[PDB]
């Protein structure tokens, strides 16, 4: 479960960066 | 004074490195751009903007400078002259460079 | 077109922006805000011109009228139903924004109490009788409010923000000494046992407050009368349980709490069980009367109306000029009112 | 200062037209509903007329149900639009059970009908005394300057008339 | 008229909760246009330009 | 400047009027569009609104030592500010009549108050720096009207009269059946059979002599001893005398005074010590 | 507005005073030219028109569960509506006299019926939910009158 969380947080950040990239 | 129109001209004059009346042609172009609407990527929560600036510092390999930034943030909050801190903070974040 | 007709015969909207806007008058000292703003904008290099809801001068006193008794206000922000405050965009043209904030913040905190006191209104017996006495003052406080409402509709207008503000000051000082009573009134909800101590001790906080005001009164005797209204109607079920405990022998109580811990013994080997509560000499009169009625209803062999009348008769001749000083004398007429019934009840005990 | 409340009833009427207008578009067939006159005075003369078996302009006798019918569409009711339209129906119903009682009195004849009780005819001779009495109360109902003094009076009567009419309009007769 | 009014009233309940911030009258027009076929995306866009245009004008 | 000065004087701050909260005396701003002369006079009309909010703060503080004469004196004190708040609202209509009135008119009108307000600042100050309470509030106000000035002498005997009414209720309830009112223990009659009663010489005025105090003591002790024993033997009666109604009426008659009458107070100390004193005298005769 | 509101409270719907059989008679949300504050006090007046048509159906349903003290209880319920309907009519002659009025005046006059009406609405729902009839009707109203509130 602990590992599941680390991957989830990781997903959350990239789609934030990708979002700032799309906007530009 | 400090009407929008008078302030936008002063900005253009110094950044283009040309006289007041000689930055006019770009001055008109500047008014259309600002009067066309956009909406920021981050619209809600003052914190969402701050964490972004803080992430940027790490990325640039300047962890120490992001600590210094937190300290400055408290200073800005306490003086209370500005009521749209976020606009100022999003704006420098965007114009960040290496 | 109908929309345009409404817009002229009704004053221009200021809860939604879609009506054009006045903040003009020919006097030189009434355009003060336009002058004040201008000053800030040139002196301060860093001035933030707010987005201000243009009001609609001296209609802020109509929102003070509603707010002090009446309904929740959805024209101004209330963070909760016990916290009334005034939005930071209200300007009246003949004052500064800041200067304005400061008069509206006095009435906001005075409407915070009447609005809070209105959430106590539930449309046990003691609380229901305290509710009808608080609610009674509210229908007599709106009589003065509905008077000031007919003043602003009359042409010429007359009123400004602050001119009927020292007219509604007796009621204003009456709703504040209500606040000191009520904080001490209900603030026994976290305390253990909700049963007899809440009901008793809210009749007792009314009793404590009438000494603090009556014996320093006679320069605001307006506040002495109010706390006594709240007492005569709060004591009204709590005396009439004692009226039923004598002339019928047994009494009425809620089936989920006691209001006086008056209890009768069903087997016969003692009369009545007592448990102490919160005045103190009057409690002994209840023990001796119930002892004697409890035998006589199992074995025959061989007050409120009066209170009101002894109060009135001092009054036609709180302060009085047939009693000194002052409210405990009208009370000691009541201790003979129980007494004339009480001694002749106990008369009958030895007769059986 | 004039608000919607402080302006008047007439202001409400202008607004009511306006509020309507948005909903009238889809109730529209190819055009929206339009307003129709009645004055305040036309209603207070009409309220007495339904209660004696007579029609006025507001009231349309329907002979395929023996009931009265008010104008179903928007009638502007002076300065009280479409609230009276609903109020005028409860008192319209009260005069209907009056025309059903009056219709019922005529039915009984002993020309050669002998299954129509003698007792059943005596029931009508007491019933008709009850019908003239109603008429004499409507003759004393004047003056009517609000629709309210007329509706609240007949909170008592409105319930009474339903019992008294629709026990027989079943058809018991004779010893039964 | 009865049916129509009763959807609108339910419709005004949602609008005030969801924070549309439109008026009653204006919403009825939005709904009539939909039933006659309009695209939703275009319709919000027009509303938005008109809305911004009104605020600026008043001040 | 005119409407922000009318309401800052009523106790509602501006922000061209800046409230520095009873430290210093900068209470109006420096204003560029009025003259250099006009911002200097503005601070002077504001010191008379600063000492006005030093008075409205002292009411709420002593409306919660913290004695009940402290508080009788506060509800005395709100009636000196009653012509003050009344003259500010009489000024509102003067500035609507023409917009040709400025703050030199306001000076002329608001100097019937510069002969009242510093002198009452000193009354309230000696109160809060010694923490005085009791009947010695009356004794402060009495020694402050021992000073001159005709506006301050009419006013502080009216502030004296409202709180001498607060004494009048004590000493009438004291000489009825022997009731002693003490909510904080403020009155000169001390407590701590017949029970115990004693007098404090440290809460007693200088306009009440020692020899005047003891007419109130001895009468009050006589009625008290019948409150234990039997009240059909009551000197003042209750059933058998309506002298208590005469005593009420006499008290009410004298309750107010135009300023303060010393001779009327002590005249009724005679009357309560006689007439009703013929009742217990004929007991101890026979006893 | 003022007089047209009186007809909403003797149970007759406009399309402004809309009747819903869930939440009751209610003023329609943010209709053109109605102050934020006036819709709030107009909604407190509509709760006294909601319980008033929840009371007139309770008469007509059981006159003209079964019982013969139920319909004696209905002529028990018509007697509390008696001062209500007189105070709607004393508003009625005032608003024919002049047309400028505040809704604070109806707020002031009909609060008296805002503390009789909730306390009797629990009575008729308690009758219909334990399904009780008869001589225990006399018992059902009696022990509530033992309860608080002088009105």
UniProtKB/Swiss-Prot annotation, chain B:
It is found in: Cytoplasm, Cytoskeleton, Microtubule organizing center, Centrosome. Interacts with gamma-tubulin. Necessary for the recruitment of gamma-tubulin to the centrosome and for the formation of a functional centrosome. Belongs to the TUBGCP family. This is Gamma-tubulin complex component 3 homolog. It comes from Xenopus laevis (African clawed frog). The lineage of its organism: Eukaryota, Metazoa, Chordata, Craniata, Vertebrata. The chain holds residues 6 to 103 of 906 of the full protein.
From Swiss-Prot, chain E:
Its main location: cytoplasm. Keywords: Cytoplasm, Cytoskeleton. GO terms for biological process: gamma-tubulin complex localization; microtubule nucleation by interphase microtubule organizing center; mitotic spindle assembly. GO terms for cellular component: centrosome; cytoplasm; gamma-tubulin ring complex; interphase microtubule organizing center; spindle. Coiled coil: none annotated. Part of the gamma-tubulin complex. This is Mitotic-spindle organizing protein 1. The chain holds residues 8 to 66 of 72 of the full protein.
């Amino acid at each position: 479960a602990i590992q599941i969380n680390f991957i989830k947080n990781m997903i959350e950040e990239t789609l934030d960066d990708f979002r700032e990239a799309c906007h530009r | 004074q400090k009407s929008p129109n008078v302030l936008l001209q002063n900005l253009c004059c110094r950044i283009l490195g040309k006289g007041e009346a000689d930055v006019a042609q770009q001055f008109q172009y500047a008014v259309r751009v600002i009067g066309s609407n956009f909406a920021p990527t981050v619209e809600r929560d003052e914190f969402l903007v701050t964490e972004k600036i803080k992430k940027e510092f790490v990325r640039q390999r300047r962890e120490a400078d992001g600590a210094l930034f937190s300290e400055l943030h408290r200073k800005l909050q306490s003086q209370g002259v500005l009521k749209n801190r976020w606009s100022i903070l999003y704006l420098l974040l965007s114009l960040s460079e290496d | 077109d109908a929309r345009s007709w409404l817009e002229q015969h009704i004053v221009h909207q200021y809860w939604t922006s879609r009506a054009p806007r006045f903040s003009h008058s020919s006097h030189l000292h009434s355009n003060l805000s336009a002058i004040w703003d201008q000053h800030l904008y040139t002196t301060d290099p860093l001035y933030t011109p707010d987005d201000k809801t243009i009001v609609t001068e001296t209609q802020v006193i109509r929102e003070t009228l509603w707010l002090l008794s009446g309904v929740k206000k959805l024209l101004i922000f209330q963070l909760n139903d016990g916290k009334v405050n005034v939005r930071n965009d209200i300007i009246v043209t003949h004052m500064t924004q800041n200067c304005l904030r400061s008069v509206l913040e006095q009435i906001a905190a005075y409407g915070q109490v009447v609005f809070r006191l209105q959430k106590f209104i539930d449309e046990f017996r003691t609380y229901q009788a305290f509710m009808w006495a608080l609610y009674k003052y509210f229908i007599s406080f709106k009589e003065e409010l509905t008077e000031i409402e007919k003043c602003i509709i009359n042409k010429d207008e007359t009123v400004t923000l602050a001119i009927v503000l020292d007219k509604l000051a007796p009621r204003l000082a009456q709703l504040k000494v209500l606040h000191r009573v009520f904080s001490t009134g209900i603030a026994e909800v976290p305390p253990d046992t909700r049963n007899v101590v809440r009901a008793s001790h809210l009749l007792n906080t009314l009793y404590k407050a009438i000494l603090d005001y009556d014996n320093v009164g006679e320069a605001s005797e307006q506040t002495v009368s109010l706390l006594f209204c709240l007492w005569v109607e709060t004591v009204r079920p709590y005396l009439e349980i004692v009226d039923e405990w004598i002339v019928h022998g047994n009494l009425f109580d809620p089936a989920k709490e006691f209001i006086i811990q008056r209890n009768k013994d069903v087997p016969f080997n003692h009369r009545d069980f007592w448990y102490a509560t919160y005045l103190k000499p009057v409690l002994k009169q209840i023990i001796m009367a119930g002892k004697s009625m409890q035998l006589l209803k199992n074995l025959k062999c061989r007050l409120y109306t009066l209170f009101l009348e002894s109060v009135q008769s001092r009054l036609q001749h709180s302060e009085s000029v047939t009693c000194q000083s002052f409210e405990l004398t009208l009370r000691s007429c009541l201790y003979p009112h129980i007494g004339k019934q009480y001694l002749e009840c106990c008369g009958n005990l030895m007769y059986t | 200062e004039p608000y919607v409340t402080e302006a008047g009833r007439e202001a409400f009427d202008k607004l009511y037209k306006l509020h309507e207008g948005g909903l009238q578009i889809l109730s529209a067939t190819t055009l929206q509903p339009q307003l129709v006159l009645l004055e305040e005075t036309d209603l207070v003369k009409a309220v007495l007329n339904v209660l004696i078996g007579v029609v006025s302009s507001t009231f349309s006798y329907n002979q395929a149900l023996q009931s009265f019918a008010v104008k179903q569409g928007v009638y502007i009711s002076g300065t009280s639009p479409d609230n009276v339209s609903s109020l005028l129906t409860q008192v319209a119903e009260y005069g209907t059970y009056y025309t059903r009682l009056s219709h019922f009195s005529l039915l009984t004849v002993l020309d050669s009908s002998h299954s129509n009780g003698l007792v059943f005819q005596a029931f009508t001779s007491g019933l008709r005394k009850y019908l003239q009495y109603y008429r004499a109360c409507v003759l004393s109902t004047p003056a009517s300057l609000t629709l309210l003094t007329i509706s609240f009076l007949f909170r008592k009567l409105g319930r009474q008339l339903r019992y008294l009419a629709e026990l027989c309009c079943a058809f018991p007769t004779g010893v039964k | 008229m009865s049916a129509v009014r009763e959807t609108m009233d339910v419709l005004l309940e949602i609008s005030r909760l969801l924070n549309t911030g439109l008026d009653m009258e204006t919403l009825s027009i939005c709904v009539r246009l939909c039933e006659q076929g309009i695209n939703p995306e275009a319709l919000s866009s027009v509303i938005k330009e008109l809305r911004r245009a009104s605020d600026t004008l008043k001040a | 400047m005119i409407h922000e000065l009318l309401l800052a004087l009523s106790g509602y701050p501006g922000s061209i009027f800046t409230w520095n909260k009873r430290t210093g005396l900068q209470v109006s701003q420096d204003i560029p569009f009025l003259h250099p002369g006009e911002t200097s006079v503005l601070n002077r009309l504001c010191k008379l609104g600063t000492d006005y909010i030093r008075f409205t703060e002292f009411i709420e503080q002593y409306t919660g030592l913290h004695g009940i004469y402290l508080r009788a004196f506060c509800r005395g004190l709100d009636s000196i500010l009653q012509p003050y708040r009344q003259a500010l609202l009489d000024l509102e209509q003067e500035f609507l009549a023409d917009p040709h009135l400025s703050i030199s008119h306001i000076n002329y009108s608001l100097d019937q108050f510069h002969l009242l307000f510093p002198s009452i600042m000193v009354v309230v100050e000696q109160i809060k720096s010694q923490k005085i309470h009791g009947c010695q509030i009356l004794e402060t106000v009495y020694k402050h009207s021992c000073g001159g000035l005709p506006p301050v002498r009419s006013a502080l005997e009216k502030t004296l009269a409202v709180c001498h009414g607060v004494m009048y209720k004590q000493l009438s309830a004291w000489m009825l059946h022997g009731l002693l009112l003490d909510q904080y223990e403020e009155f000169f009659v001390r407590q701590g059979s017949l029970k115990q009663f004693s007098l404090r010489a440290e809460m007693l005025p200088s306009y009440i002599p020692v020899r005047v105090a003891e007419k109130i003591l001895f009468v009050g002790e006589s009625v008290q001893m019948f409150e234990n024993q039997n009240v059909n033997m009551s000197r003042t009666g209750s059933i058998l005398k309506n002298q208590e109604d005469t005593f009420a009426a006499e008290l009410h008659r004298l309750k107010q005074q135009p300023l303060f009458s010393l001779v009327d107070f002590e005249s009724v100390l005679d009357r309560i010590r006689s007439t009703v004193a013929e009742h217990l005298w004929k007991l101890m005769v026979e006893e």
